[PDB]
Subunit: 302 residues, 4 copies
């Protein structure tokens, strides 16, 4: 009667199962892929948000083995110069975001001319035909440009993005800490099922999946990876750091205030320490082992 | 052993699934049906409550494309005059409510003579034989009058109302924000299952279903429609507005105080903006697409 | 692997389903049975607790159509005299409780000689052999005495009580508002499943089931009856009334303080008004209709 | 798609079912086994934590019929002397913990020479090859030494420990009140399923299982035993007692403050009183009856 496609699971619905292990946390290999052709030293990227990622944060994150996505709420001169700034600070990679509306061609051109490593075409709805069309137009114009498209939350959405020409699929409709999509629209898919459904398709093509939204604790990063993600995208977790664009707070807002957190490097150290522990507990030598072989148990939340 | 008919779902048990879309929010078509023969420009109607709907609110809502139901807790002169007031403010439609007890014939006659577009026969229990009898008596007396009957929460209740002669079925036993039915009586059906069960029957006859109770957020409106409703009836959401009959509050009570909310037009704008977004995300060009083709996922609430 | 007998449901797991009805709340028939041979005008009895039932409350409740159980924490003279007090206030019925330990014979004799209508043999564990033995000894000694035995929470426990000679089975292990059994012992059965399992057996013999514990709201009374109970036993709900043995409170304690509630008659009126409403909504003309024909839906608690 | 091994249950997901009983709480037999060759008078052991167990607590617990595990965060002289202290206070048994890193041989030798009854090889991950290797090395060196290995949370982990030479398997990954494993790593198994899976294997060899972590209330002890554990290990429950190493608190920290609790003997008395009650309710004459024959119901947590 009611058209229910299936049950869907979020981070708090599952735990990872410990397994025989020869991995110690300090020996775990955190290397992974952002896109088909771009490797990362750690599985973390920053959100393309005007309170999270500008050049300073992008530099800090790349030095720690991640990549930042310069947000689009700035002029092209400003966004190209930020790209260039990162590129000259010693062979660092950088991304930049553009919207999916028509008229973005000059922004894309400037970013590409500035040496951007990866273009993110950011949308609240990656399965929208206008998004697919922007990706197809960009891929035709720039046959060798690494392109992330998103966000999707289904197998069919991931397949559509891949067939539009993306280099990586970004997943997340509903899960972000801002919570407006779900409440305002009634649309979303719990993020563990969303990642798995997208990865089920993406794996067939060797296309990485990026898990975007809902990461609160380092345990969520492990679960996101085990569900099939190659890396995670975080906004709230890095907002309020020194590097982000009677107590001290910084603005965090949807594209609210967050308590000051100090320097990004310590946050990243704590988060990856958790991941390293999980890899020791699950016997995962590499991110790929975690992503393809670790097992979950479903829990009640009692 | 225990006589359990089935499991039943409420709004918080489900999310809508994003889908391929050529719909933009500004292009979504919000037109729908209130009854077999009455169209609405937006899928919203107001509750027949003495703290929610009198002439002023009914006028404001009709100007925005909805319809109001003038409550019955007033004399006939008063209720007929309120009907007339709305009708003369420029070709606006209006409803009015009457109780299901015997002796309502003169009230119904006066409302009909005042030009009421739709008569609501309101009951806490639409599957009661006394209600069915009042609907049958009214339908026989006024063969062409649009009549809403309710409330029901089951397939069998919807079928009984239709067989009594209603023009639309109103659903909701248990879900209203007042919460007394469930707590006091132990009776109710979670509203997403209630809407779907009623729509399963009503669809066979082209009879609209009105989802009444439990709408807190614009996301609930989308879900109600996707479960099979043609429009939603709201009480709490409009109570406390300027138009409803050291902080400022208005009474909201069952047939309690609610913080002042300003003008109805802004509320309606925000609520329909959410619905338009959901339609963009689900690829629903029209209310009918959302109502008949969108899909849900079941969630745990973790 | 894990020895799980089945899933079990409490009051908050279920709702009653509305049904076709010719019953109005004021026409509902609240008569029921306490025991095989004792009728009640309403389905309520009071707990045998030293902060709930002495003669004054027992009188008030019997005048409203219920029956009270004089608690045992008093001497025999005191407990017999309390029995007699109720019996002389105009043809009122009364119960009295005794413990299940050996040595209760003189207490039982005195109660029987005082005219007690029903003897309650009260235990936290009715399936204990010592309890069954006390019931068997009492039944042999007093072949015509109405005897309630309890508490049990299973089919097998109900069958054992019946085979020991009880006139009614009292159900409840775990559900009481005091909550110590569950927390301290880890033992219990959710009360809706407990009632149904016990009634499944008891019905085969025409033996009533009394639902004891966990009743918070009048909705719980309806659900208890629909699960198979003939009446409900309440402690917290009547504790703190005028009649029970800078704000005003009375002691409520396990065999804590409760806010003063005024007179018992108003409480009973409100509780039975809820039940009458439920019977109108479910089309239950009599307690037996509710107990044997009404249907539930299972809910998530979202 | 998603690699989910199964659903898993914690203490709050289940209740024990009452059963026919000839057991009174005062007649229940609390004797059990710690290891293959070490009996206990009550099923309780203390955690090897630097805020829970040193000689004073170990003595007090052994006098009540349990055994304590002297923690390792002290020198060998200190840890051997603490062992000796307990051994001379009148034929008391004592355990001691060592880490699983290489270099522990002299610590183990000193503990064994001091008369330690049981060696605990403590790890957050008992299925780690380094742990299995330390157990195998210890078993080869000390063919007759009772050795506890842990912690594991799976059948396969329990089997690995047994095949490494342990005398008892300790279970718990994720359940401890400190909660860091789950949150930081995303790894864990709900403790009732973890105990049952481990006991399913261990039972085949007559090897006891020790349930470690998550015990808050005496009801949890009963459930842990019924799930298959022979005894429980507690940290938080004994931290803050007089004997543990403007209000009064003691440190409780992971290997935080806890309110002062008075003397250990009263805590143990209350906890075992709950267990005795559960055994009366379930008809379990002995710990083995509870561990192998009692039944659970699954509950929703409403
Ligand atoms: O519900 C939303 N309302 C918004 O206004 C919004 N803006 C961004 N995003 C998305 O949230 C992601 C970051 O989520 P977290 O704060 O949980 O890391 C981001 O990376 C986006 O995918 C939004 N989600
Ligand atoms: O539980 C209830 N006790 C009452 O006294 C009551 N009065 C009205 N209604 C119903 O609630 C609907 C409006 O519900 P919301 O405030 O959730 O919009 C209305 O449209 C009615 O269907 C009641 N429900
Ligand atoms: O957990 C418990 N600890 C106690 O000390 C206790 N004493 C009584 N009872 C039982 O609770 C019933 C009344 O429960 P309510 O307050 O929910 O009506 C009573 O009728 C009893 O069945 C107890 N339960
Ligand atoms: O999540 C954890 N973080 C820690 O730092 C930690 N240290 C000890 N343990 C384990 O917790 C057990 C005691 O748990 P309880 O306080 O629940 O009795 C102990 O017996 C250990 O198994 C830890 N768990
Ligand atoms: Cl999608
Ligand atoms: Cl989520
Ligand atoms: Cl109905
Ligand atoms: Cl609902
Ligand atoms: Cl029982
Ligand atoms: Cl219960
Ligand atoms: Cl394990
Ligand atoms: Cl747990």
């Amino acid at each position: 009667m009611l058209r229910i496609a299936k049950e869907a699971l979020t981070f708090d619905d599952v735990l990872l199962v410990p397994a025989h292990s020869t991995v110690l946390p300090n020996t775990a290999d955190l290397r992974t892929r952002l896109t088909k052709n771009i490797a990362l030293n750690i599985p973390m990227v920053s959100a393309s948000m005007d309170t999270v990622t500008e050049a300073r944060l992008a530099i800090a994150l790349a030095q720690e083995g991640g990549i930042g996505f310069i947000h689009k709420n700035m002029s092209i001169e400003q966004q190209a110069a930020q790209v260039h700034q990162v590129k000259i600070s010693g062979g660092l990679r950088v991304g930049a975001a553009v919207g999916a509306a028509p008229g973005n061609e000059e922004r894309v051109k400037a970013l590409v001319e500035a040496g951007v490593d990866v273009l993110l075409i950011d949308s609240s709805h990656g399965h929208s035909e206008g998004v697919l069309q922007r990706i197809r137009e960009t891929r035709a114009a720039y046959p060798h440009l690494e392109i992330i498209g998103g966000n999707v939350a289904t197998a069919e959405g991931a397949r559509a993005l891949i067939e539009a020409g993306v280099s990586a699929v970004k997943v997340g409709i509903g899960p972000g800490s801002i919570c407006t999509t779900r409440i305002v629209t009634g649309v979303g898919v719990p993020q563990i099922t969303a990642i798995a459904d997208a990865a089920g398709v993406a794996n067939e093509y060797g296309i990485p999946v990026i898990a975007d939204g809902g990461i609160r604790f380092s345990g969520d990063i492990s679960k996101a990876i085990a569900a099939g993600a190659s890396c995670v995208m975080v906004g709230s977790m890095f907002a309020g750091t020194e590097e982000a664009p009677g107590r001290s707070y910084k603005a965090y807002r949807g594209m609210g205030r967050i308590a000051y957190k100090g320097h990004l490097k310590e946050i990243i150290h704590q988060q990856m320490g958790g991941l390293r522990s999980c890899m020791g507990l699950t016997g995962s030598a590499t991110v790929e082992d975690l992503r393809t072989k670790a097992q979950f148990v479903r829990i009640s939340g009692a």
